[PDB]
Amino acid sequence: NRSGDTCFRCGGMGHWASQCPGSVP
Numbered sequence: 001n002r003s004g005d006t007c008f009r010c011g012g013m014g015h016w017a018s019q020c021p022g023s024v025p
């Protein structure tokens with residue numbers, strides 16, 4: 001958002017890699 005917070009785990013951004021949605025796809 002206001003930083004280079006590119007979420008490398010999901011390929012998205014805005015959140016940290018450990019918080020990617022994947023419990024219930």
Ligand SMILES: [Zn+2]
Pocket residue numbers: 007008009010011012013015016017018019020021
């Ligand atoms: Zn993510």
